Amino acid sequence: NSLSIFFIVVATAAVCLLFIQGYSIYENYGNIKEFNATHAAFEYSKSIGGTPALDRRVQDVNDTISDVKQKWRCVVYPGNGFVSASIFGFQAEVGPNNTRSIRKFNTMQQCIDFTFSDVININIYNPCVVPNINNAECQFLKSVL
Amino acid sequence: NSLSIFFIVVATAAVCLLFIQGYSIYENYGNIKEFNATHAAFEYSKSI
Amino acid sequence: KTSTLIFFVIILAISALLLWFQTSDNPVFNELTRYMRIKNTVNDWKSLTDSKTKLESDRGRLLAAGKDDIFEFKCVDFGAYFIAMRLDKKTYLPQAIRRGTGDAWMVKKAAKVDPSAQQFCQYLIKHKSNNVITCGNEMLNELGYSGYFMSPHWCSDFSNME
Amino acid sequence: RIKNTVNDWKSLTDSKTKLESDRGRLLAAGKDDIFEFKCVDFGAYFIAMRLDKKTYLPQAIRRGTGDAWMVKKAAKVDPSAQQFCQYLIKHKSNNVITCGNEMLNELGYSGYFMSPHWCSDFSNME
Amino acid sequence: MASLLYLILFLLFVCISYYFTYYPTNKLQAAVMETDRENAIIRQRNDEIPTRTLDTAIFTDASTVASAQIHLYYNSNIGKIIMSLNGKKHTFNLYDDNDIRTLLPILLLSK
Amino acid sequence: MITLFLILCYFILIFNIIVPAISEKMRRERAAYVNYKRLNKNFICVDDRLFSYNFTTSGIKAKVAVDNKNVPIPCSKINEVNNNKDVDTLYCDKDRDDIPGFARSCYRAYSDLFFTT
Amino acid sequence: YKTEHCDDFMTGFCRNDPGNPNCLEWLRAKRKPAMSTYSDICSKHMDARYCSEFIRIIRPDYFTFGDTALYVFCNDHKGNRNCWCANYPKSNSGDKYLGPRVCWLHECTDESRDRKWLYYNQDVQRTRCKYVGCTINVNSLALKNSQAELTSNCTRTTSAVGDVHPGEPVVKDKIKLPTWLGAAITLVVISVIFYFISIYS
Amino acid sequence: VYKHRLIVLFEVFVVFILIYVFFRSELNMFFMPKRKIPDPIDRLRRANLACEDDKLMIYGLPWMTTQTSALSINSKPIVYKDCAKLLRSINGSQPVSLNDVLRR
Amino acid sequence: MLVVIMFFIAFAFCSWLSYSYLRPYISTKELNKSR
Amino acid sequence: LSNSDRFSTVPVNRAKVVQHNIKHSFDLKLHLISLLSLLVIWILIVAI
Amino acid sequence: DCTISLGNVSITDSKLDVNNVCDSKRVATENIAVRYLNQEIRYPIIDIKWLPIGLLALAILILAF
C-alpha cells in the first residue's frame, strides 16, 4: 500500500502547510499590513514601459509638437520690448474696432507668464497673410524663429 | 496499523514545520548578511 | 462508498470557500498578494538605493561646499529635454520639479536649440515649483524605481557623465 | 557568534570590574592622596582622577554626559593643559565618571578591554 | 483506451494549470514580465563590455602608441560607450562611423 | 475513483485557477480603462504614436491611428485626430510586420495604462 | 590640403561631415576658410568630439575662432552644464568666472574637464591657480561586498570628533509569542483531527 | 459510470469556453517569437584589426564596403612601421574579432 | 446519481458566486452608457 | 565639515544601538529546529 | 595642504578607510560606526498561488479511498 502512504503524506503536507500558513498569517497580519502600507510603491513600479512615469492628468504642449517653429517663444522686439512669436505669427490683442495688434510686454517674465499660461489666450496676428501684411514684421518673424 | 499512520502523519507535520523554518531562514538571508556586514567587528570582541 | 462521496462533497465545499476567498476582494487575500509583490522588489532594490543615495548625498555635500545658488532651481538641459533641477537643502540630493504624481517634468525639445522648452521650464520654476521629486530613496518610495539604475534618466550616472 | 558574544559582554564586564576593584583595594594602602583628584599625564592628554571612595575603582572628572575629561596636549610640556586640569579639579569636580559598572550603565562600556583608555592604562601602570 | 484518455485529460489539466500559474494572463502581468525581460537583456548586453580597468594600446597620434589603462561604460539602450582614459571621459556613439573607427582599435588591442 | 479525481481536478482548475484569473484581469483592465476614459482624450501619444483603447468582454484592447496608407499618424496631429471621428485604426492584437517597431509601441501603449494599478 | 585649391569644395563637404579625417586634416592646414567653417560648425555642435580636436588645433595661435564658437554655443545652450564656467547660470553674473577668476571655482579648473568649455583667457589662467586644502583623488574604486570610507579632515587642529549618529529606532518592540507555539499548535491540531477521524471511522 | 465521464467532458468544455472567451489573445501571443531588441554593437562583432603594410585597417565591417583605416584618438589614420609586430604581440598570429574580445 | 447532483449543485453555486462578484467588471453596459 | 551633521553633539550609547539591533533581528530558532529534528528522527526509526 | 592620489583601488570582501592625516597629531582611530538597522523581518508566507495546488494535493486522498 505504498501509494496510499504517499497520498497520506502529501495530503498531510498540504493540510499542515495550510495550518502553518494560517497561524503565521494570524500572528503577522498586522506586521505585513504595515509593511505593505509603508512599501506601497514597491508593488508595481511606475516604469512598466521601461520609461519614466508620466502623469497624463497634467497637460504639456511640448509632448506632441515636433517642429520648433510651431511653438510659442518670447523674443526681443528691438526698441519695443518682448513679444511672443511662432510660425503662426504673434500673440495679438484686440484694438478699438476688433483689430489685431502685436501684444508687447515690458519684461521677459511677463511675456513667458502670458505665453505659457494654461488659460486660452491665443490670438494669431500673422504679419505675412493677405489681410495684414508688411515686409518689416514678416522679415523679423522669419529671422527670429 | 492506525498508530503507524498517526506517527507518519506527525512526522510529515514536523518535517513541514522544519521546511517552513528553513524557508524563514532563507527569506531572511539578506537581513542576516546585512546584520553580519554591520556587526562583524563584535564577533569576538570583549566590549563594544 | 459513502465516505468517498462525503469527501467528494467536502472537497467541492472547500473549493467554493477558496473561490470566495479569491474572487470576493478580500482584505487578507489582497494583503498577501501585495506582500509577495512588494517583498520581491524590496529585496531587489532597497539596499542598492540606500547605499547609492548615501553616496550621492556625500557627493552633493562635497559639491555644495562654497556655492550659494546651488539650492535654487535652474533649467538643466539633458539633450532631449529640460528639467528644472536644484540641490535639496536637507539631503543634498538632486531635486526636480515634479509633473503631477509622476516623475520629473521633462520638457521635450523639438530640436537641439529649443527656446520654447527653455522658457516653459522657466515658467515651471516660477509657478509649479511646489511639487518636487528627489532621486534615490524618495523616488523609490513614491514611484517604485530610484532612477540610478535606469538609463536614460536624469538621476542615472551615465546620463550625467555623458 | 555575534549574538552570543554581545550577550556575554555583560558577564565579562562584571568579572573584570570585580577583579579590578579587588586590585584597587590592594593598591590603596597607606596612600591617602590617591583618594584625592590628581592631574595625571597620558602623553597626549591630562585627566583628573582618583580612586573611588566606595568601590575603589578609578574615578575621573566627567565631561558633560560623556566620558572623563581629556585636556588634549599639543606637546610634551603643556602648562596650559595642566593648569586647566587644576581648574577643573578646583571648580568642576561635582560631576565624575567611575570605571566598571557605572560607566557600563551610563555609556555602554566599562573602559576595560578598550585600548587606549584611562581605566586600563591607569590600572596597568600603577 | 480509457487509461489513455484519462492520462490525456490529466496532462491537459497539468498544462493548463501550469500556464495559468506561471504565465501572464492579463495586460498588467504581460507588461511587467516584458519589462523584466527587456531589463535583463539590457543588463547582459551592458555587462558584455568589461567594466573593470583594462590594458590597451592607445594611439595618441598617427605613429605614436602608448600602453594605457582605461575604463569603459557601455549603455546599450542608447548605444554609447564612455571611455575613461587619463581621467577624462570620451563618449563614442556606436552609430557613428568615425567613432567606431576610433574606438575599435582601443577595444581590439586590449588584453 | 479516477474519474471522481478528474472531476475534482477540473472543478478546482476552473473555479480556483481560471475564474480568479478572469477576476484579476477584469478588475485591473476595467480600472485601467476607467482611468483612460477619465482623461477625456480619444487618442493619446504613446511612443510617438496615437493609441486609443476600448473595453470588450475579453478585456481592454489598444489600437493605433493610421492614415489611408496604413502609416501611423505622428502625435503632431493629435488634436486633428481627436476631433476626427472616422480615423483609420489598426488593432495591436494582429501583428503587423510592415510597421517598424509596432510591437514595442503596442507594448508601451499597454504599459502606460497601469500608472495607477 | 597644402594649397588653397580644395578650400571652396571642402567648405561645404565638411559641414556635411565634420568628423571626417579628411576634414580634420583640412583644418590642420590652419587657413582662414577651414577655421571659420569649423567655428560655424562648432557654434552648433560644440559638444561633439571633432570640436575637441578643433579647439586643440586652433589654440593658442587662432583661439579667436574657438572663442566665438563657444560664445555662440553657450548663449544658445544656457541649460548645458558644461557652459556654466563660460556662461554662469546666474542671471546678472554670467561673467562671474571669466579670466583669472576661473580658479575660484575648482570644477572649472579641472583635469577631467575638456578645455573646449573654457575661453582661452580662462584656459591660460588654469595653470596659475593656487589651491590650499586636502584633496583625495581615486582613479577607480572597484569594491565588491566591501564597505569603504574616504574622509579628509583638513584642519591642522585635532577636532573634538565624536561618534556617528546611529539614527532613530523606528522598529517598535511588539509583544511576541513563544517561538515553539506555532509548532505546538500545529502538532496538537493535527493529532486532534486525526483522533477525531479515527473515532468517527 | 458514463455519467462521470460526461461530467469530465463538460468540465473540459467549460474550461475551453472560458479560455476562448477571455484568454484568446494571450494564447495567440504564445507561439510567436519574442520581440527583438536592437543591439548597437551587433554589427561590430566581426570587426578585426588587420594590417596592410604599415597601415592599420579595420576589417569585418559589412556596411563599410571599402577597407577603412583605423583612426587614432585625434581622428588621424594610423600608420605604424611595427604594425605587424604590435598586432602579433597583442593577440597572436590568429586574427581576433570584437566578439572574441567581449567573450574574454 | 448523487455525485452528479452534488456536482451540479456545487457548480451552480460557484457559478452564481463568480457571476455575482464579476458582473460589475464584465458587464460593459455602464461603459457603453458613458459617452 | 562636509559631514558635520553625520556626527552627534550628544554622546552616543553604541552598546544600546547594538543591543537593539540584536533584539529586533531575525531569530534563527535552532532550539526548535533541534527539537523537531530529534522528534523526526525518533519517529522515523523507533516509532515507525 | 596635503593631497592623496590613489590609483586603481580594488577591494573585495574587506573594509577600506582612508584618512588624510598628514602627521597632524591625529590618533589612529578604528571606531566602528554602528547604526540602527531598522530591519524588516520577512515572514514565511508561501505565495498563495499555492492554495489551489495544495487543495489538489488533499484531493488525491480520494484515490486512497
Curated annotation (Swiss-Prot), chain B:
One of its GO terms (biological process) is membrane fusion involved in viral entry into host cell. It comes from the Viruses. One of its GO terms (cellular component) is membrane. It is found in: Virion membrane. The chain holds residues 2 to 49 of 146 of the full protein. The chain crosses the membrane at residues 1-20. This is Envelope protein OPG155. Part of a stable entry-fusion complex (EFC) which is at least composed of proteins OPG143, OPG147, OPG155, OPG086, OPG094, OPG107, OPG104, and OPG099. Formation of the viral membrane is necessary for the assembly of the complex. Interacts directly with protein OPG107. Belongs to the orthopoxvirus OPG155 protein family. Its main location: virion. Contains two intramolecular disulfide bonds. They are created by the viral disulfide bond formation pathway, a poxvirus-specific pathway that operates on the cytoplasmic side of the MV membranes. It comes from Vaccinia virus (strain Western Reserve) (VACV). Induction: Expressed in the late phase of the viral replicative cycle. Envelope protein required for virus entry into host cell and for cell-cell fusion (syncytium formation). Keywords: Disulfide bond, Fusion of virus membrane with host membrane, Late protein, Membrane, Phosphoprotein, Signal-anchor, Transmembrane, Transmembrane helix, Viral envelope protein, Viral penetration into host cytoplasm, Virion, Virus entry into host cell.
UniProtKB/Swiss-Prot annotation, chain D:
GO terms for cellular component: host cell endoplasmic reticulum membrane; membrane; viral envelope; virion membrane. One of its GO terms (biological process) is fusion of virus membrane with host plasma membrane. Contains two intramolecular disulfide bonds. They are created by the viral disulfide bond formation pathway, a poxvirus-specific pathway that operates on the cytoplasmic side of the MV membranes. Residues 1-126 are virion surface. It is found in: Virion membrane; Host endoplasmic reticulum membrane. It comes from the Viruses. Its main location: virion. It is a single-pass type III membrane protein. Keywords: Disulfide bond, Fusion of virus membrane with host cell membrane, Fusion of virus membrane with host membrane, Host endoplasmic reticulum, Host membrane, Late protein, Membrane, Signal-anchor, Transmembrane, Transmembrane helix, Viral envelope protein, Viral penetration into host cytoplasm, Virion, Virus entry into host cell. Envelope protein part of the entry-fusion complex responsible for the virus membrane fusion with host cell membrane during virus entry. Also plays a role in cell-cell fusion (syncytium formation). Part of a stable entry-fusion complex (EFC) which is at least composed of proteins OPG143, OPG147, OPG155, OPG86, OPG94, OPG107, OPG104, and OPG099. Formation of the viral membrane is necessary for the assembly of the complex. Belongs to the orthopoxvirus OPG107 family. This is Protein OPG107. The gene is OPG107.
UniProtKB/Swiss-Prot annotation, chain G:
The keyword Transcription regulation applies. The chain crosses the membrane at residues 181-201. The keyword Cell membrane does not apply. One of its GO terms (molecular function) is hydrolase activity. It comes from the Viruses. GO terms for biological process: DNA-templated transcription termination; membrane fusion involved in viral entry into host cell; symbiont entry into host cell. GO terms for cellular component: membrane; viral envelope; virion membrane. Induction: Expressed in the late phase of the viral replicative cycle. Part of a stable entry-fusion complex (EFC) which is at least composed of proteins OPG143, OPG147, OPG155, OPG086, OPG094, OPG107, OPG104, and OPG099. Formation of the viral membrane is necessary for the assembly of the complex. Interacts with OPG094. Interacts with OPG153. Envelope protein part of the entry-fusion complex responsible for the virus membrane fusion with host cell membrane during virus entry. Also plays a role in cell-cell fusion (syncytium formation). Belongs to the orthopoxvirus OPG143 family. This is Virion membrane protein OPG143. The lineage of its organism: Viruses, Varidnaviria, Bamfordvirae, Nucleocytoviricota, Pokkesviricetes.
From Swiss-Prot, chain I:
It comes from the Viruses. Residues 23-35 are virion surface. The keyword Transmembrane helix applies. The chain crosses the membrane at residues 2-22. It is found in: Virion membrane. GO terms for biological process: symbiont entry into host cell. Induction: Expressed in the intermediate phase of the viral replicative cycle. One of its GO terms (cellular component) is membrane. Unglycosylated because produced in viral factories instead of the classic ER -Golgi route. Keywords: Membrane, Transmembrane, Transmembrane helix, Viral envelope protein, Viral penetration into host cytoplasm, Virion, Virus entry into host cell. Its main location: virion. Component of the entry fusion complex (EFC) composed of OPG053/F9, OPG076/O3, OPG086/G3, OPG094/G9, OPG095/L1, OPG099/L5, OPG107/H2, OPG143/A16, OPG104/J5, OPG147/A21 and OPG155/A28. Except for OPG095/L1 and OPG053/F9, each of the EFC proteins is required for assembly or stability of the complex. Component of the entry fusion complex (EFC), which consists of 11 proteins. During cell infection, this complex mediates entry of the virion core into the host cytoplasm by a two-step mechanism consisting of lipid mixing of the viral and cellular membranes and subsequent pore formation. Belongs to the orthopoxvirus OPG076 family. This is Entry-fusion complex protein OPG076. The lineage of its organism: Viruses, Varidnaviria, Bamfordvirae, Nucleocytoviricota, Pokkesviricetes. The gene is OPG076.
